[PDB]
Design a protein around this ligand. Structure first.
Ligand SMILES: O=C(Nc1ccc(C(=O)N[C@@H]2c3cccc(O)c3C[C@@H]2C(=O)O)cn1)NC1CC1
Length: 167
């Protein structure tokens, strides 16, 4: 049993809710919150901008030190950093950004990072300002992630479309 509330169950291991991932993280304090990161960990907008703002920019400060030491992530890759006031840990995962021309097949590799964590709160990778079709992202999630994932979808209209079209 865990503290995630109000989710619709899609499969054995994937759950979904119309929720602001920032507000959900503040309330559950999950072991892992996933950030929709880019390779530079520049958290300017979308989910990343919102999570970073909620940390009062501490996420960005930590991220800048990470990049200065390690260099950029790979598209499809990830790193574990602090969850600050939102979670124990933040798993920064880089999905492909269609608006940069990145190969959508890398979306499966991106979701594979979730399998290193038993339970996660997450957004749909490559959705929103990353330009991919969220319905496709949900399908890849369900067909790739085997650990327990709680997906937060900010837009109510999109959430309803995601549920109603889910196979
Ligand atoms: O700003 C706050 N939260 C958030 C959460 C998600 C996002 C975000 O870009 N979502 C993506 C998005 C945006 C518009 C339409 C969409 O189809 C999507 C899919 C993405 C998602 O839903 O994952 C931005 N901001 N919280 C402050 C405390 C009030």
């Amino acid at each position: 049993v865990n503290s995630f509330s109000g989710y619709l169950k899609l499969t054995d291991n994937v759950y979904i809710k119309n929720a602001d991932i920032v507000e959900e993280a503040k309330k559950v304090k999950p072991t892992v919150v996933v950030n929709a990161a880019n390779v530079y960990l520049k958290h300017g907008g979308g989910v990343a901008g919102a999570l970073n703002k909620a940390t009062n920019n501490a996420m960005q400060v930590e991220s800048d030190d990470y990049i200065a030491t390690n260099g950029p992530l790979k598209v499809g890759g990830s790193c574990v950093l602090s969850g600050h006031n939102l979670a124990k840990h933040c798993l920064h995962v880089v999905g492909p950004n269609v608006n940069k021309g990145e190969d959508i097949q890398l979306l499966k590799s991106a979701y594979e990072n979730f399998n290193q964590h038993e339970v996660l709160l997450a957004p749909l990778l490559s959705a929103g300002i990353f330009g991919a079709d969220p319905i496709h992202s949900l399908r890849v999630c369900v067909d790739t992630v085997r650990t327990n994932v709680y997906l937060a979808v900010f837009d109510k209209n999109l959430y309803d479309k995601l549920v109603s079209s889910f196979l």
